[PDB]
Structure formats: structure tokens, C-alpha cells
Write a protein that binds this DNA or RNA. Structure first.
Lengths: 184, 122, 222, 158, 147, 57, 51
RNA sequence: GAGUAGGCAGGCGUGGAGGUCAGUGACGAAGCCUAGACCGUAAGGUCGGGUCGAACGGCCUCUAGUGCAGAUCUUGGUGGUA
RNA sequence: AUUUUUGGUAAGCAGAACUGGCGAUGCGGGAUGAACCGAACGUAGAGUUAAGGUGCCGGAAUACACGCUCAUCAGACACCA
RNA sequence: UAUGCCGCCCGUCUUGAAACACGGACCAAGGAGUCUAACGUCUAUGCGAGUGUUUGGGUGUAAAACCCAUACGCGUAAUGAA
């Protein structure tokens, strides 16, 4: 019985949300059903993105939505954000759209409604698009969180030192310039 | 109806050296010694609890009677096993007075629920 | 909703025409084997009469069974036995004889017994110990529907069609052999003979290439 | 103490060769190296500039940079439990082309010729290579070859 | 929550998860940043390059209120005007109804030029500006009034 | 009093979870390549970009 | 499939898989003869065999 | 389907806390004793009998001075030697 | 610990190379033994074997077959005495 | 309880413990990874270009709950010794 691999190794993927939220579990229930029956690749993506954690569902901005509909041919699709849809006061023009999020911010809800658009849930979406007909699934940038600039620090990575004060006297002298000993 | 009940290990799992010393109780305790013959499992030492001994899931929590034991305090608690007489056996709690046992055994037989304890408390 | 003498009768009619294809195929393979023996036997007799010896074509199929435990196997043979899928003792696989395989058998010789598997022994193995890889989940065959589901892509539609694509090394040998789960044989019926197994067969041991005597061993182990 | 110098343990390998001393023959310099070309690494001890470490002697990499008297080679260096991307800077006498990759790059054109030909003819090409197949059934003829009955020899000194 | 701690899960096992050879002793390296140049050099030079030695010139009695100058980009400039009156300016402000953004009351020293503002006269009042800030405000058609 | 060095178990440790290839990307490391080839190559690629930006009509 | 029965006995799973099992049994193909009046011994093979 | 050091998960038990079972209880709470019984792989749980005499429990949660055979451990008591 | 191997008369000594083991490992065998052989282990039933044996202790032929050996210090199973 | 076979005394340091290595006569009770300031990772929750009521004020069925202004911390900009 010369085992090739690790015996009784877990898949290593979330099969449920560690969230104990009642309304998320009702939403997972709907999408576990649709994922099983529909046999449309969309429903498997949405089920997993519902299981995903706060660090892995970063907020998709309205400005990022406006950019994803700036694309040619994909201007009338429904914008599936699985996570928060945040506001961006940077842009001024916003088109008439329908966006299916978990949560909106009071600013994001104002801007999408004012353009003339429809703020959808995932169940309001599922009742109109069982197979995600004419959808555009988006994700916010994961590798922008402030913790990720310290991941795999060493010489000469150009990664952020974990520090609490940021001026001179704090981690610039020896080993950050050829003058004092060496550089990185 | 039930499959013929088997229990793979009937006799109790007494702690090692519970016989030898009085300070040591026979309440099972895993031998976490570096040289323990019980932990290392030498031919002739006691057997340890292993999940593999786990009773069949269709025969689990059934008494010899074939009824899952349900602790009952009062008539209110007995009156819940009414549509579950083939399934359960009412057992009056240890701290119930003789007069309250008179009432429960009266009601138990009136509904047709098997009881393991009284006895009538003579 | 009738669907009792329409759907049931339709797929029954489909089953009967399929068994009729399988019948004439198994009749074709019986004919293929019996004439192929007769030809080789007559060729040997033709040559003896001519006054000139006849070399039987080098065996192109070998049945490999791992006769060794799992403890104290060095990295080289160990990984070769992981590639032939002999991950436990009395595990059997098939291997098409090539240079890239004959040299693997030279490496793992001290951990296995192998030889030239007859038609009969192959038939008995795939009947009694026919297991398939389907969504890995090792599933017993028990029905030629399960073969022609997964291996119908390559043209094999039956147990006897699979046993054919092994016994006569086919263009879909790789597929048919890798589909078959590694045979889980038991220890032999009357033993090994052989007081000590882990010498080479020639010395009076058991391990290594036992040309035709694998058939006997394997049936005993079956 | 112990010696771990650059050219340490390299008596016999950076040695020149028997009756192949003296000058480098000019084909070495006239040879053209381009990026993506797989080249060997083998130092010429007679030339003591841009010479590789004894590790890289015997290795094969691929040219990544090309400059005046020199190339740049990428080699796979296993250290502990993982390979790294080791960039050498070698003068052109310490390298040569690999007939390894020359025999492949001509097989590609041989396959291209076989297929492009047999697309518009009677087809039985089988483009893949197969290993040494178990030899087919032959008749061996004993016409003036009546087998010689060999016997084993008795022992004798010298 | 003491009952979730692995201390509760450790009761019974001899060494309490700290091993039988390490023993868990008081201070087997020293007490905080000790031997940073000696036996913790590898961890200091990695992860904390630049810790040891001095760099640059000292500043005695450095009041952080001199160096205030908080910054506002042009992408965020229009967010200063309240949303009650915002859209009336952003649709035909146009010279004499050009809105007045006092960035010092908003609590910014400098204006920097990162964003694209809409083509509107947007009279900006800032203590400091970038070359590209005053470029883009004049381009859009406004002005920078220094205060 | 101690011992000094052994490479025993070091292979086993390495092979357990490890020996792994560096993954080989397309468009490789164009760093430590001839600086004047680079200086030019930039202008070549910028030229090809302009030529396809002209071709787009 | 609660039980793997065995093709080689039970006779039913042998007639299920391999319908040719009927024809083989009926015609007795496991007991085919079917010759000979050849018959071709050798010339030199026998002398090289004996020697 | 092994496992020291070690990690993680699922539970068992204790002192208190919020909620609930209109919970049990001088017709006997808790405690202790039991070559009686039943449940649980187990930590443990439940019941019968005795003694006893004033409180205590299930379940959903909160919290911790929360589980002992070893420390030439502490205090108190007890032995064999006798 | 087999194999390659340095120092050393040597070592159950000191130090290396590759691999396998003990450590952290129970089980069958070598009477006993950390490392040898065979095999790695949930709880049971049935069947078959490994190494090792089958006079008696002791489950199993005082089996068959060809030879050798007579010891007033017989000999008797690898590592291993 | 008898009988066949099996079974060295646990805990510990250890390459190696039944050890002619250490602690342990016996029993009850007590008895050892805690709290805190500041932080890394991962996760949950809220709100999200913001966020954080509770230093303080108002209020109160009164150390609770409820409400709240101006700041302030962190974030929304980096790089330089400057």
C-alpha cells in the first residue's frame, strides 16, 4: 500500500461559507440548487464566489463597472459583483445598467439609481437569468490589500518592511544604502 | 424491527494500572508515556478505544428492548412520545417523587409507552 | 404518459441489436485466435519438415505481479513500481513489451514476477477481477454497457472486445490497459513451491521473468 | 584548513587534452550564436577569461544574451529542493552547439516533409517514433549451417 | 474565551505542546532585540535591513505642525463641493457662475494633479499647487487663487 | 565531542515536498541583456505599435 | 450492483457478458480436433536433435 | 485507516453568568456507598437499592482561579516495618 | 545495517558517501534482543501465504530420495555470539 | 474462580530504560501556558473613501441602556539626509 499522495487530504477549498449569515445561507441554497440542475458554467462561479471570504471578495467600484461596460459588445450585460459594490466620486459619466451585488454602499446605490440603473440581489438576478444569460462577472483587485506588499520580503525583493514608524532612523541605515555597509 | 444487535467490544475500557493503584481511577485515560507498553500496543497488554469499535448506526442508542431511552420528568414530557411508542422507552428521572411516578406509570400504560424503571416504588 | 411499451420497448430493441453486434464480434475474435494458433503451430511444423528452425515472434505482452512488500524498496525500483501501478503486494498490471518497458522490468526484477500471459489466464482475470477506472472511483465491470460507455469512444463495446485489445496488443492497448484497474490478486492456492521466494526464478526462487509459468502462478493467485 | 577556491578540485578537467595543446582552431570563432540556441558549457583552460565554474563544466543551457567576445547562457541549478535560473557570461571558446537540438530541428522538417507529402497520396505515415519492438517471426535456414555442438571446457593453468 | 484556547486541549499531554527537548525555558536567546548584530543578524539583515547605524541629519525641536500640508488630487477636487449644489455647477457653471472650492477650509495645504477634472471653470483656492495642478485647472478653464 | 556534517536524509527532505522546475514564462527576463540592444528594441516595438495603430482603420 | 457475482460461474452473468458463451458450449469449441493426414516429420532436425 | 515531538478538528466533564423547560424536590434536593442494570469507540451519561436531609438540574448561549499519578510538589491524614 | 571508504593493531572506536531502517513501530520469525528477515497496524469472520519451520516441549511428515560423518571435547541455520 | 497461551513498572532525560539510571510507602484535597500594553497572519461582523458613539456632553427604569458636537488616530500619496 505504498501511498503515492497524502491519504485523507481535504480538497483544500471552501464547500460552505464560514459566515453563519442566515440570508447568505438562503442565497447559497438557491445557487447550490441552480449549480446542480442548470448545467450553465456561470452558476458554479457564483456558488464559489459566495463561499469566498472578506479578503477574497474585495469591493468592485462603480468606476470599474463603468470601465467593464466601456468594452465593445458588452455594453447591455448585467454586472454580477459577488461582494460589495463601492462608490467612486472620481468619475462623472455613468450609464444605465443592471448590477447584481451582495451589498451596495449608500453612495453606490445613489449613483447607479441616478444614472437610471437597477440594483439587483443574486436571487432577483437568478429569477431573470437562471443560466446567467447576458452577464458580466467582475472581481475587485486582490493584490492591492496593504498586507500583500510584505509577502515574501527578503533581499532583494523590493517588498515593504513590517514597521510601525516610517521616517528616517527607522530601517534605512545599514543594508539599505552602499554608504552604510551594503544595500539589501 | 431491527438487525440482530452486535457490540464489537462489550467489556469496559479500564485505564491501565487502575487495578494496581487506588490513586488511579479506571475512567479511561490515554497512556501518553514515552516507553508505555499500553500506548506502543505490545502483544498481551490491554486494548485502547479505537473508532473502529463504533457500534452499527442502525443498532446505535437502542436498548436490548430495541427502544431509544428518553429521560421523562413529568406527564407533559411523557405526552411527547405518543406517536413514537415503537421508537422510544420513557425512563422516569432519578429525582421524581413516588406520587409523581404513580401518575406517569398510569399515563404511560394509558398511551402504551414501555418504561424500564418503576417498579411502583413499593 | 404511457412510456412503458414505447421507451422500455425502444431501448430493449436497441439492447437486442447491440448484443447481435457483440455476438458476431465475439465469433470473429474466437475465429481470429483459433486460426492464429493453428498458423503458428503449422509454421513450426512447416519449418521442421523444411530442415530449418522457426523462431516464434518475441512475446509482445507481459503480465507483471508485485511479489514484494512495501518496506525497504530503494527510490529507483520504488518509483518504477509506482509507474506500473504495483503499489501493494500481489498487485497485477499488463505491459506491452518495448525497450522503454523491458528496461523497467530489468530495474524492478527483485520486487516482481512477470511472464507471457496466455489467452485463458487473461480471460479469467478480466472476468473475475475486471475493475475499471471511471471518475477514478474503481467500479466493477459486471456489465459490457459500462465498458462501451467509457471505451466505446475507441471502438471496444464488450468484455471480450477489451480482453481482445489486451491479448492481441492493439492500437488502443494503452487506453484499454490504463482503463483496467491494477488487479488485486491473492496469495497462490498451493503456495509458490520455492522454499524462499526472493531469489531469481532460474536459481530456484520466484522473482523475475518466468516465461510461460506466470499463467500457472496467476491462476493459483486468482 | 579546507580549500574552496574558484578553480579548486579542477586539475584534470581544465587540463587541455593529450596532443591538443596550444592554439584554438578558428571555426570556434567563425561559429554564430543567436538567442534561443541551446549550447554546451566546457571551459578551454588555455583561455582564462569568461571561463565557467567547474559546476557548469559539462552542463547544457540556452543562449539569452549575445555580445562582443561572449554569450549569456541560462542553466538550471538545483540547490536543496528547488532549481534557480543561473545566468552565466561566457567567452565563446568555453561553449559549443548541441547536436542534441540539431537532430531534433532536422526531424521537425523530416516530419513536415512526410506529412505535407502524404496528405495528397496513399497514407500510412505514423509520424511518432516507437521503441525497439519485439522481433517478428523469422525462419532460420540450416543450409550449410548445420549447428556446431559446443561443449564446456575443462580447467587448465595458463 | 479560555475554553477555545489550546491550553484546554493540551491538558493530559506531558509537555503542553512546547516539546520534550526544547523544554520551554525562560529566555534561550536573550530579552528582545538582543544579539541583533551577534546571533540574530540573519533575521535583522533580512526583514529589517537599515535597522543598525545612523542616516541623515538631526532636527532638534521638530514641531510636526510646520510640515502640515495635507494633499488633495484633482480626481477628488470636485468631491469638495456639496452634492446639494454640485450638478448645477457641473452642468453649465460657465464663467461668472464658476464655483469657488476653498481647499484650506476642507483641510488641505497642497493640491496635486493626478485626476482628470470635467471641462468646467472651477476657481480653486489653495495654499500650494503642483505645476500640473494649475495647468489642468487653467485647461479646464478655471484658476488657482493663492491664499 | 559532537559530529560535524552529514548529507543523510537531505535528499528525502528535498524530494518529500520539493524538487521543482522554475515554470519557464513566455517573454523571458530581458534584464542583463546587452543595454544597446534593449535601447534599440524599445524603439523597434514602439515603431511596430505605431504601425498597427496606423493599420487600424 | 450490490454484489459482484462472478462471470466464470453462476452461468447467468457468463451468458449476460459474452452471448457467444451459448454457441461455444453448444458447438463444443473447447474440444475442436480437427486433423491430420499430413504428415511431415523432418530430415536433418532429427539428427541435430539426437547427435 | 501505524505513529513520538508537533499541528488542526469534533466532542466529554467543572465553578459561575444570560435565556428557556409555567423543569425536579421534605410523599425527599445535593452529597456519598453499591461483585445491580442500560447507553456511549471514549471522555462520560442514565437508572434501581441504601444512607441522608435542603437544595438541584436539561437545553441554547456568555465567562473562567475549569479536569492530575508523578514535581526528593503543598497541607492533612494513614500505613508495612512492629 | 549491506556496499564504497579515511584514521587506527584494533574496537559494541573515531569520521565520511549513496540508500534503507530505529528514533517515532506494534505484528510473524531469528529462544531471548531498537536496528536483522517477512511484513507495517480501524473492529471482526472466512480463505491463502510471507520470513521461519513440521521428534517432544510446539501448531505442522519420527515425510520421501541420493550420499557423507562415529568424535574419551562430535555437529546442528545467515546478522550472532 | 480454574485452565491454554500471552503480559518486565509506571512517569522522565535519552541514539538506547525492565534496568545494577532518576521521582514515586499510601490516600484525600490544593497544584503549573494566565492577564495586560503593543503588534503579524488568518477568519467573522459592521460600515466602506472612508472609518472609529463611550476622553467628554446630553440622558437614564442609574456603573447598564439610549442619543450627540468638535476634534483626533488610521486610511485617502510617494520619495529624498534635507
Amino acid at each position: 500500500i505504498d501511498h503515492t499522495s497524502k491519504q485523507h487530504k481535504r480538497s483544500g477549498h471552501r464547500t460552505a461559507p464560514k459566515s453563519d449569515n442566515v440570508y447568505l445561507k438562503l442565497l447559497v441554497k438557491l445557487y447550490t440548487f441552480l449549480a446542480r440542475r442548470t448545467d450553465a458554467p456561470f452558476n458554479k462561479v457564483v456558488l464559489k464566489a459566495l463561499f469566498l471570504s472578506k479578503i477574497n471578495r474585495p469591493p468592485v467600484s462603480v468606476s470599474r463597472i463603468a470601465r467593464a461596460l466601456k468594452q465593445e459588445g458588452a455594453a447591455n450585460k448585467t454586472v454580477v459583483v459577488v461582494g460589495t459594490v463601492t462608490d467612486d466620486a472620481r468619475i462623472f459619466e455613468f450609464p444605465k445598467t443592471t448590477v447584481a451585488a451582495l451589498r451596495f454602499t449608500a453612495g453606490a446605490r445613489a449613483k447607479i439609481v441616478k444614472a437610471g440603473g437597477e440594483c439587483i440581489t443574486l436571487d432577483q438576478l437568478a429569477v431573470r437569468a437562471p443560466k446567467g444569460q447576458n452577464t458580466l462577472i467582475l472581481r475587485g483587485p486582490r493584490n492591492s490589500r496593504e498586507a500583500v506588499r510584505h509577502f515574501g520580503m527578503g533581499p532583494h525583493k523590493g517588498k515593504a518592511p513590517r514597521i510601525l514608524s516610517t521616517g528616517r532612523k527607522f530601517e534605512r541605515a545599514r543594508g539599505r544604502r552602499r554608504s552604510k555597509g551594503f544595500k539589501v | 424491527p431491527h438487525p440482530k444487535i452486535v457490540k464489537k467490544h462489550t467489556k469496559k475500557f479500564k485505564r491501565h494500572h487502575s487495578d494496581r493503584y487506588h490513586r488511579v481511577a479506571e475512567n479511561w485515560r490515554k497512556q501518553k508515556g514515552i516507553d508505555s507498553v499500553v500506548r506502543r500496543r505490545f502483544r498481551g497488554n490491554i486494548s485502547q478505544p479505537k473508532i473502529g469499535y463504533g457500534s452499527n448506526k442502525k443498532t446505535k442508542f437502542l436498548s436490548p428492548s430495541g427502544h431509544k431511552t428518553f429521560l421523562v420528568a413529568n406527564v407533559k414530557d411523557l405526552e411527547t412520545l405518543t406517536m413514537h411508542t415503537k421508537t422510544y422507552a420513557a425512563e422516569i428521572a432519578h429525582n421524581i417523587s413516588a406520587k409523581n411516578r404513580v401518575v406517569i406509570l398510569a399515563r404511560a400504560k394509558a398511551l402504551g409507552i414501555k418504561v424500564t424503571n418503576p417498579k411502583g416504588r413499593l | 404518459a404511457e412510456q412503458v411499451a414505447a421507451e422500455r420497448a425502444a431501448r430493449k430493441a436497441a439492447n437486442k441489436e447491440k448484443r447481435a453486434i457483440i455476438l458476431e464480434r465475439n465469433a470473429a475474435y474466437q475465429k481470429e485466435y483459433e486460426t492464429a494458433e493453428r498458423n503458428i503451430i503449422q509454421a513450426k511444423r512447416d519449418a521442421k519438415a523444411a530442415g530449418s528452425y522457426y523462431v516464434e515472434a518475441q512475446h509482445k505482452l507481459v503480465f507483471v505481479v508485485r511479489i514484494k512488500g512495501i518496506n525497504k524498496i530503494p527510490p529507483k525500483p520504488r518509483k518504477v513500481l509506482q509507474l506500473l501501478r504495483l503499489t501493494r503486494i500481489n498487485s497485477g498490471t499488463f505491459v506491452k513489451v518495448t525497450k522503454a518497458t523491458l528496461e523497467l522490468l530489468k530495474l524492478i526484477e527483485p520486487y516482481v514476477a512477470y511472464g507471457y500471459p496466455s489467452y485463458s489466464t487473461i480471460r479469467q482475470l478480466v472476468y473475475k477481477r475486471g475493475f475499471g477506472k471511471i471518475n477514478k472511483q474503481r467500479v466493477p465491470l459486471s456489465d459490457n454497457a459500462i465498458i462501451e460507455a467509457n471505451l466505446g469512444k475507441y471502438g471496444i463495446l464488450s468484455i471480450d472486445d477489451l480482453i481482445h485489445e489486451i491479448i492481441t496488443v492493439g492500437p488502443h492497448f494503452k487506453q484499454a490497459n490504463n482503463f483496467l484497474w491494477p488487479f488485486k490478486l491473492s496469495n497462490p492456492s498451493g503456495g509458490w513451491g520455492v522454499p524462499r521466494k526472493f531469489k531469481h526464478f532460474i536459481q530456484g526462487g520466484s522473482f523475475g521473468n518466468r516465461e510461460e509459468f506466470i499463467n500457472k502462478l496467476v491462476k493459483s493467485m486468482n | 584548513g579546507k580549500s574552496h577556491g574558484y578553480r579548486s578540485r579542477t586539475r584534470y578537467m581544465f587540463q587541455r587534452d593529450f596532443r591538443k595543446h596550444g592554439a584554438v582552431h578558428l571555426s570556434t570563432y567563425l561559429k554564430v550564436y543567436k538567442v534561443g540556441d541551446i549550447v554546451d558549457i566546457k571551459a578551454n583552460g588555455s583561455i582564462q577569461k569568461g571561463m565557467p565554474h567547474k559546476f557548469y563544466q559539462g552542463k547544457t543551457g540556452v543562449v539569452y544574451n549575445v555580445t562582443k567576445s561572449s554569450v549569456g547562457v541560462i542553466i538550471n541549478k538545483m540547490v536543496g529542493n528547488r532549481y534557480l535560473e543561473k545566468r552565466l557570461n561566457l567567452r565563446v571558446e568555453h561553449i559549443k552547439h548541441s547536436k542534441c537540438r540539431q537532430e531534433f530541428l532536422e526531424r521537425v522538417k523530416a516530419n513536415a516533409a512526410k506529412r505535407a507529402e502524404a496528405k495528397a497520396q496513399g497514407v500510412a505515415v505514423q509520424l511518432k517514433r516507437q521503441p525497439a519492438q519485439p522481433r517478428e517471426s523469422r525462419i532460420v535456414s540450416t543450409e550449410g549451417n548445420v549447428p556446431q555442438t559446443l561443449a564446456p571446457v575443462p580447467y587448465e593453468t595458463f | 474565551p479560555s475554553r477555545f484556547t489550546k491550553t484546554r486541549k493540551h491538558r493530559g499531554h506531558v509537555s503542553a505542546g512546547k516539546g520534550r527537548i526544547g523544554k520551554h525555558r525562560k529566555h534561550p536567546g536573550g530579552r528582545g532585540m538582543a544579539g541583533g548584530q551577534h546571533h540574530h543578524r540573519i533575521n535583522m539583515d533580512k526583514y529589517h535591513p537599515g535597522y543598525f547605524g545612523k542616516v541623515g541629519m538631526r532636527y532638534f525641536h521638530k514641531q510636526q505642525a510646520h510640515f502640515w500640508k495635507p494633499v488633495l488630487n484633482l480626481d477628488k477636487l470636485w468631491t469638495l463641493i456639496p452634492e446639494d449644489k454640485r450638478d448645477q455647477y457641473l452642468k453649465s457653471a460657465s464663467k461668472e457662475t464658476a464655483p469657488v472650492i476653498d481647499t484650506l477650509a476642507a483641510g488641505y495645504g497642497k493640491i496635486l494633479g493626478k485626476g482628470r477634472i470635467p471641462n468646467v471653470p472651477v476657481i480653486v483656492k489653495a495654499r500650494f499647487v503642483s505645476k500640473l495642478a494649475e495647468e489642468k485647472i487653467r485647461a479646464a478653464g478655471g484658476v488657482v487663487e493663492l491664499i | 565531542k559532537s559530529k560535524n556534517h552529514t548529507a543523510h536524509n537531505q535528499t528525502r527532505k528535498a524530494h518529500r515536498n520539493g524538487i521543482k522546475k522554475p515554470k519557464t514564462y513566455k517573454y523571458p527576463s530581458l534584464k542583463g541583456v546587452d543595454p544597446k540592444f534593449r535601447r534599440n528594441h524599445k524603439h523597434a516595438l514602439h515603431g511596430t505599435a505605431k504601425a498597427l495603430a496606423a493599420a487600424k482603420k | 450492483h450490490v454484489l459482484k457475482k462472478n462471470p466464470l460461474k453462476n452461468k447467468q452473468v457468463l451468458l449476460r457478458l459474452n452471448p457467444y458463451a451459448k454457441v461455444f458450449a453448444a458447438e463444443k469449441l473447447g474440444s475442436k480436433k480437427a486433423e491430420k493426414t499430413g504428415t511431415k516429420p523432418a530430415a536433418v532436425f532429427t539428427e541435430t536433435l539426437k547427435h
